[PDB]
Amino acid sequence: ATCAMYGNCGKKSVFGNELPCPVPRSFEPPVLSDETSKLLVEVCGEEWKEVRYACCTKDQVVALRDNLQKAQPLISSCPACLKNFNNLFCHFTCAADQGRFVNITKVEKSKEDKDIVAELDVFMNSSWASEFYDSCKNIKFSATNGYAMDLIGGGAKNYSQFLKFLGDAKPMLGGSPFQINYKYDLANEEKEWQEFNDEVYACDDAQYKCACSDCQESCPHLKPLKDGVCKVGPLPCFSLSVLIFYTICALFAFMWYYLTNFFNGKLANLFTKVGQFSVENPYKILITTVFSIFVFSFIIFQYATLETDPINLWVSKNSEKFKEKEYFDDNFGPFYRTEQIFVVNETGPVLSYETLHWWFDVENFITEELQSSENIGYQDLCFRPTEDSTCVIESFTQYFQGALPNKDSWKRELQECGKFPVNCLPTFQQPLKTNLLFSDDDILNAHAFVVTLLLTNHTQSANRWEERLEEYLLDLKVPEGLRISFNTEISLEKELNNNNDISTVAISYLMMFLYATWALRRKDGKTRLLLGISGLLIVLASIVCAAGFLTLFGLKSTLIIAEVIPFLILAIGIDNIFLITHEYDRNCEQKPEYSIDQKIISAIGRMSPSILMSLLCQTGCFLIAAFVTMPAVHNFAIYSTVSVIFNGVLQLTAYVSILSLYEKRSNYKQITSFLKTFYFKMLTQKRLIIIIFSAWFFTSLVFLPEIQFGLDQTLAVPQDSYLVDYFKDVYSFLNVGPPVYMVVKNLDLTKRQNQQKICGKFTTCERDSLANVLEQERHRSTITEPLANWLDDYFMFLNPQNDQCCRLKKGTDEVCPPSFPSRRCETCFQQGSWNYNMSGFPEGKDFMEYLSIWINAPSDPCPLGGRAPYSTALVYNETSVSASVFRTAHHPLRSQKDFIQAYSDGVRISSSFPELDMFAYSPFYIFFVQYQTLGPLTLKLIGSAIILIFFISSVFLQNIRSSFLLALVVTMIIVDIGALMALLGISLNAVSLVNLIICVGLGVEFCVHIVRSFTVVPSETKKDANSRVLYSLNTIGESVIKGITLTKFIGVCVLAFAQSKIFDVFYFRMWFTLIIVAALHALLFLPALLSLFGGE
């Protein structure tokens, strides 16, 4: 029994620290004189029993008792930390029986009125101190969600930095003890040899256990081990499979030479009698067409004027996430309109007394707002969690309730509010975290700060107020060294309305018309005077009649069809015009004793089956796109197929009539190797061009999966707008992204079974419980912010030691007011039966009985569980409860791939709870459901179309060889466009998907006419494959290139000044790529493939 200090020598004039004095080792005190009874139960535990000798007085016991009485409510959550904490201080202070302090040096006064030990050291084991700190490094607080370790170690994250926190302080005396390391010649064995450890417990490997919300060990060590397929490989799976499949062929290709029915055959009796019907009474055909135009343009102007401007065109109705979105709105209100304003110092920190003297005027002038329309105020439209609550505003001015200027002491108060947001509460009891309103954590060196204002009232007067707010938000001033940025809900809508001016589209169609008319006019003398005008008017009549006919069935018309349906129907219609006309003008040279009517009947009997074939392939390709989830493409497919069939019937009825009438009112006296003819010698290079397009196809098919998915609303904001700076500020200065709410649909009363699946801060909670699972997901998923668990807070509201709030007078089931500051009312639960052991609280009627009292009063004196935090958090049923939500947030989500990953997390987490009925809601979730299936949907849709093209082409051609060649070319053109999407920065979303469908349609269009002409024309022909290839080019190829050149003129004219970035990305580059790739595959690859196929 050798000690290091004993005697309690010296006293002190005030403050009752009553400090102890040192002593030598050769000293043994008499003990057990009823101090051991007091030293056992109420201080540092019953581990000891009949301890032979101790080293502390009764005075030091009661001083140690009161010291630990102050510190134990701060640590009582995790029992292992509390126990080894008390065991530490007891083995130090009183159990100096075993020498746990050595080499005392400085005593204030040797034996005078001030004889005490100060500034002395202690040895200790590193393993022991590490296991002690590991069991205490992350601990939440009792009255709040703050880190209790942060109260006892600062921003420690270090055991030695936590040891030195214990060195010197205002309470009793600072001794600065802890010095762990003793590397060389400590002392003799058992004589001053001294290491320290007493079997330190932890959360695990111990009969005691803490919570997962507290301790990292209590969480599932089997954090989800399968982790899901990362879906990305250092080797691209599909690309590597493509490479090796081509390479095993690449070896062999060099080593193997290193060694009765006439249904569709004579269907043209129905096309004959229609044409013969078109030339007989053609005037009424033209009259009926031109009058039906008046009828439909009428319908469109008066009826179905709506143009489906709302965002309900992208989202699929009857889907999971849409039903979930409505279920959110009906119970928890709608998502608040957000108005975020950035204030930023470029190259430096923002916070200065001048900036506060500036925002002094701003925070209140925005409660005035430039005398808006009929005096609408922010206080009159704000967000109120309760009707008597004040208007909320997120800004560090609410750390000071608006009472902003404290010139002498603002830095410290702001550091206090940043680290410890409690006791920094605004007019509303809702606290504020720095990451939500600051770019960087250390506020004094933060490059920017975020002031966010939100509203609840979702109709058009709030938007008229925002229209009033912007003009003066632009007219507001700024210092020379400061920057600002801002945004509101209707900003993007107005930026879409801003650059809607595209006269370029009008002049584009102008140039297309001027060329399209100028076709084959001066071959055999001046001709073609106003015949192209008629065909263009009939083509336009097709889309107007379709638009009116489908507004008859009350069908919505998107902005997308306004650019696609004209572009598509023109591209096909003028192509049929040039085929019909040129075939007539060639019949005028062979056997001109055929009258004009027999000229056009013979032309229709030759080529109308090609039109029907192209039409069936396209319409089937468009009906496949009808079996889709979202209506933006569904309405497209209906519009498309119906506009195609209206054009396919008018250009073979009405245009046939106007052709007859035009060539009959003119006398047209007929009297008859050019440049287009000179390219017949180039075809001797058969194999080269096919290898070129084969490498073109293989290279495109390898780069095929590098296309990005999505669409960024941030791109489209026009140049020199007030939002281009805003998104760059969000990319760098905003720390929190979209909020996520976990909603549980329908449960009963707390039966203590259901709650063990949601409780986090307690011992008797499942491993698979909600808060613990979300804690282990939060380390690695898109959600980083901790969650608002009102059940843990509602149960922490009734613990007696941290209650100045829950009180009642006589067990009367009637509480005592918060404006009643008196001790006459006692705690709601017994100081002993507070049931921390298990998840303990009322289950039936008494659970609700205390729940209504919990949200009865706010939390100003007792800052825990007011009405303001969780007023709208749960739609409580009168009998038990209905639903409730638990909010959290995302890490900022800057990229579009981040948005997609955020959603796939929002779907993988909800599928982790087969026990419960829950789901996740974020405003943007309903918009990104498409991308989870868009890849395979593209593959299914296109491949289905291609195989359907194969079937229909094999039907009309009555042969599979040429039809397969058609299918191979049309497959190839899409692949090449897909890689060219990757290269041209085109994102893959619904918009570009529709345009790829019409790519497939037009690609089909080009090729069908040629491959139909590869069928024999027995009069004046050869069965020689190359010979009818030359036929297909000098007959149809010239007409095809003359329907191509105009569709190229559109691209070039569009590009010159179409400033709409979304139009310039997804429509110019798409279409330009389409016409180029498809013309090169149709004019070059197709003829070489066919001629070399037949070449034998």
Ligand SMILES: *[C@@H]1O[C@H](CO)[C@@H](O[C@@H]2O[C@H](CO)[C@@H](O[C@@H]3O[C@H](CO)[C@@H](O)[C@H](O)[C@@H]3O)[C@H](O)[C@H]2NC(C)=O)[C@H](O)[C@H]1NC(C)=O
């Ligand atoms: C944030 O905005 C403020 C306000 O415009 C700017 O702070 C500037 O910080 C620099 C560097 O600390 C100051 O330079 C110093 O100026 C004194 C003269 O008072 C000179 O003797 C020192 O040697 C040093 O160069 C500068 O004065 C200060 N600006 C003003 C108006 O006082 C800056 O734009 C941002 N803060 C940064 C860059 O730290």
Ligand SMILES: *[C@@H]1O[C@H](CO)[C@@H](O[C@@H]2O[C@H](CO)[C@@H](O[C@@H]3O[C@H](CO)[C@@H](O)[C@H](O)[C@@H]3O)[C@H](O)[C@H]2NC(C)=O)[C@H](O)[C@H]1NC(C)=O
């Ligand atoms: C925002 O919510 C309120 C819900 O009423 C609407 O704003 C305005 O609210 C005041 C009352 O707070 C209404 O004034 C009252 O109108 C009645 C006639 O209806 C009149 O007899 C009273 O003397 C009083 O003036 C006011 O009508 C109402 N609307 C407007 C335009 O001022 C408003 O409907 C909501 N905002 C939006 C954008 O929907």
Ligand SMILES: CC(C)[C@@H](C)/C=C/[C@@H](C)[C@H]1CC[C@H]2C3=CC=C4C[C@@H](O)CC[C@]4(C)[C@H]3CC[C@]12C
């Ligand atoms: C709309 C979503 C999808 C995305 C874009 C939103 C981003 C910002 C605006 C989000 C991110 C976190 C959000 C957030 C965090 C916390 C709270 C407290 C809560 O009691 C009301 C909502 C409120 C006040 C909102 C405001 C809007 C914020 C700041």
Ligand SMILES: *[C@@H]1O[C@H](CO)[C@@H](O)[C@H](O)[C@H]1NC(C)=O
């Ligand atoms: C204490 O310090 C002295 C030096 O004063 C040193 O010689 C000794 O080894 C240290 N430990 C003990 C117990 O004396």
Ligand SMILES: *[C@@H]1O[C@H](CO)[C@@H](O)[C@H](O)[C@H]1NC(C)=O
């Ligand atoms: C909710 O309360 C109603 C009465 O207001 C009760 O009929 C109903 O059963 C409750 N819902 C439950 C228990 O799921």
